[PDB]
UniProtKB/Swiss-Prot annotation, chain A:
Functional description taken from the UniProt entry: Component of the ribosome, a large ribonucleoprotein complex responsible for the synthesis of proteins in the cell. The small ribosomal subunit (SSU) binds messenger RNAs (mRNAs) and translates the encoded message by selecting cognate aminoacyl-transfer RNA (tRNA) molecules. The large subunit (LSU) contains the ribosomal catalytic site termed the peptidyl transferase center (PTC), which catalyzes the formation of peptide bonds, thereby polymerizing the amino acids delivered by tRNAs into a polypeptide chain.
Crosslinked positions (Glycyl lysine isopeptide (Lys-Gly) (interchain with G-Cter in ubiquitin)): 39, 51
Organism: Saccharomyces cerevisiae (strain ATCC 204508 / S288c) (Baker's yeast)
Source domain of life: Eukaryota
Residue span relative to the full protein: 162 to 225 of 240
Modified residue annotations for Phosphoserine: 60
Family from the record: Belongs to the universal ribosomal protein uS3 family.
Descriptive protein name: Small ribosomal subunit protein uS3
Subunit structure: Component of the small ribosomal subunit (SSU). Mature yeast ribosomes consist of a small (40S) and a large (60S) subunit. The 40S small subunit contains 1 molecule of ribosomal RNA (18S rRNA) and 33 different proteins (encoded by 57 genes). The large 60S subunit contains 3 rRNA molecules (25S, 5.8S and 5S rRNA) and 46 different proteins (encoded by 81 genes).
Protein's gene: RPS3
PTM remark: Ubiquitinated at Lys-51 in response to stalled ribosomes. Ubiquitination leads to activation of the No-Go Decay (NGD) pathway and degradation of non-functional 18S rRNA: first monoubiquitinated at Lys-51 by MAG2, followed by formation of 'Lys-63'-linked polyubiquitin chains on monoubiquitin by HEL2 and RSP5.
Subcellular location: Cytoplasm
From Swiss-Prot, chain B:
Function: Component of the ribosome, a large ribonucleoprotein complex responsible for the synthesis of proteins in the cell. The small ribosomal subunit (SSU) binds messenger RNAs (mRNAs) and translates the encoded message by selecting cognate aminoacyl-transfer RNA (tRNA) molecules. The large subunit (LSU) contains the ribosomal catalytic site termed the peptidyl transferase center (PTC), which catalyzes the formation of peptide bonds, thereby polymerizing the amino acids delivered by tRNAs into a polypeptide chain.
Protein name in the entry: Small ribosomal subunit protein eS31
Species assigned in the record: Saccharomyces cerevisiae (strain ATCC 204508 / S288c)
Residues in cross-link Glycyl lysine isopeptide (Lys-Gly) (interchain with G-Cter in ubiquitin): 26, 32
Entry's localization field: Cytoplasm
ZnF C4-type span: 40-63
Subunit structure: Component of the small ribosomal subunit (SSU). Mature yeast ribosomes consist of a small (40S) and a large (60S) subunit. The 40S small subunit contains 1 molecule of ribosomal RNA (18S rRNA) and 33 different proteins (encoded by 57 genes). The large 60S subunit contains 3 rRNA molecules (25S, 5.8S and 5S rRNA) and 46 different proteins (encoded by 81 genes).
Tree of life domain: Eukaryota
Residue positions, PTM Phosphoserine: 41
Length: 64, 71
RNA sequence: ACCCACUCGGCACCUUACGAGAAAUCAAAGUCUUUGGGUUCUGGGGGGAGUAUGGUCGCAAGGCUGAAACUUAAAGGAAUUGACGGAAGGGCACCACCAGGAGUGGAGCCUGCGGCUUAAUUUGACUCAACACGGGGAAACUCACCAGGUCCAGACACAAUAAGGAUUGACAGAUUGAGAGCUCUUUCUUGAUUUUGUGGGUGGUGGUGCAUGGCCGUUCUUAGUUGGUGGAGUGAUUUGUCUGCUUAAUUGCGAUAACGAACGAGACCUUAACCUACUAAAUAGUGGUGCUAGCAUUUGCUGGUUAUCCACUUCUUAGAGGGACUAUCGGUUUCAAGCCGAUGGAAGUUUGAGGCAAUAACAGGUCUGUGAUGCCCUUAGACGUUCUGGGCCGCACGCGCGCUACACUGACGGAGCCAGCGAGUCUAACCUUGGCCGAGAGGUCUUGGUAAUCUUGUGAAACUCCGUCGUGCUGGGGAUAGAGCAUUGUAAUUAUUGCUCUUCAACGAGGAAUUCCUAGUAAGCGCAAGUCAUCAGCUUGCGUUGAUUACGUCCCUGCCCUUUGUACACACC
């Protein structure tokens, strides 16, 4: 499906003196810009980066 | 392929004759002009057009074919 | 005789490489451009050729010595990647077997192919990967073929003819299959649109698919491709990408001069399964209520009523979510990836079935899909086109896909009586309910539907029940043929199709061989759609009834992978 989604293909027939040539063009668009559709490949698996903690600290409690 | 055959005799064409024509008309000694060959009473053939004289047969050629007036 | 240590001198092997080399490799092939221990011998591109000639030795065969002319741009070495093998080792698979199912191969017919025949029987394609294929079911059309008849739709440029008329058309007759003015007779008509010529176009189901594009099929039911940093090598390259294990998978685990990634696989997408949770619905449906029929009557049971109202969303529809991750437990295993069993679960075989699908190869098929196309051919007595008629169907016979059958798990006759995927008419005649008529086929009058609204609950068929028949080519089987009725169409003859009576063939389970298939599958059974005016024995799908037997292997066959050989690289054609 991402093919449907992200690649755009066109074949044109250039008619030259000696015969004709077939031109095929493929363009793959950046998924991260998709504006209106999946923002990535189905493949894509990002893990959010954890936060270096400064734990310890014996109990205590705030009052408001 | 094969090429050529024929029991001879190739069909021709048409010519549409010649004729230095429209002498048919008679003008007297200065100079009354009388029409030879009657003209056609069809409202699509304003009386300039004439009728050919065959046998029985008078014929409007301007009517590309049509109508068979006969005297 | 044996064991240990040492030491001369041998035949060898192992590991390394400071070092050498074009490399393969080498304790010499090292101590060489930082070039000298002593010495002998041989080579100077490839052929011509160890040939000619002379000498010499030999019994001979022949040995030693040993040229040139001429010809030629490479011959050659080592290694690398491919490609191929009628070498070796592993694997993978119902287009392979195993266990079986259902058959085809035998028969009648249908249908494609060859062959023959023919005026013509248009043509492409011939192992899987040609032969119910070209969506190829051809009565005209299609159509390309054959017998014949018209027309130019021959752009444009120059030239010529020529307004005293360049050219156009025709009635009747002749003619012709033809009510074609094709041609001719005849004599009007037309008015610069044409005609003639050359040049140039143009069309062409003409050729070339071995000139091409595009598309498609095949290898492939396969698992392969590539770069970053590091390691190896002067280099092309290699390692990564690997013994093993595991997987449908270069899928992973693991091993590890590699580490970490990308394409392909997976992911993704579509469809089938699960939601009494969500949002709803007179184009879907339930319960209640009225109005109402029948049977009982004791409240009951079974129906009618596109709105008589009320409520709901379980069944139907389709939006949004949710769900499964081989989960829990256990066995097995390098307790690794995984595989196996049990439980739970709508669902645990990639959940089932599909879509999409890398790099690369083929002189695979298609110029007969294209106003895609190069080149060649042809172009007015056309290979353009159209009209009439025939032909693709022609039948000693070979081959392939099929359909129907050989009956009693059946045929026939009454009766029960249940799907799913679909499709339908505007400037038109498509899908057709209902009523009459008709034995049937059909006919006729109306009708609903541009559709979840009507056809249609598509009341489909196998199937189920009660009967008749009773093993007899029988009432199994329905070829062939006669006679009649209708439908489509301008047209049905060589019989489009449908109905009816009659005729009642082979076929008594099919030799050698051979196809397909593992679960809602095989097989049986029908339906809708494509085609379609009319014609399905074909296909694409659909649901209905619903098994037996594997859940393995490398024996056959096909392929893939390593190893290995190569003088191949246009790559064993
Ligand atoms: Mg090699
Ligand atoms: Mg078997
Ligand atoms: Mg058998
Ligand atoms: Mg014709
Ligand atoms: Mg010309
Ligand atoms: Mg010419
Ligand atoms: Mg053409
Ligand atoms: Mg080709
Ligand atoms: Mg091609
Ligand atoms: Mg050919
Ligand atoms: Mg399979
Ligand atoms: Mg290096
Ligand atoms: Mg490899
Ligand atoms: Mg619901
Ligand atoms: Mg269970
Ligand atoms: Mg070829
Ligand atoms: Mg083509
Ligand atoms: Mg045919
Ligand atoms: Mg076939
Ligand atoms: Mg019956
Ligand atoms: Mg009658
Ligand atoms: Mg109406
Ligand atoms: Mg009988
Ligand atoms: Mg019968
Ligand atoms: Mg049909
Ligand atoms: Mg067909
Ligand atoms: Zn007139």
């Amino acid at each position: 499906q991402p093919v449907n989604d992200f690649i755009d293909t066109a074949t044109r027939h250039v008619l030259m003196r000696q015969g004709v040539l077939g031109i095929k063009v493929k363009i793959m668009r950046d998924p991260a810009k998709s504006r209106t559709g999946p923002k990535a490949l189905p493949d894509a698996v990002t893990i959010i980066e954890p936060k270096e903690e400064e734990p310890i600290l014996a109990p205590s409690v705030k009052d408001y | 392929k094969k090429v050529y055959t024929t029991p001879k005799k190739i069909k021709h064409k048409h010519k549409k004759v010649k004729l230095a024509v429209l002498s048919y008309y008679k003008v007297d000694a200065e100079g009354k002009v009388t029409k030879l060959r009657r003209e056609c009473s069809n409202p699509t053939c304003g009386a300039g057009v004439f009728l050919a004289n065959h046998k029985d047969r008078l014929y409007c050629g301007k009517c590309h074919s049509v109508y068979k007036v006969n005297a």
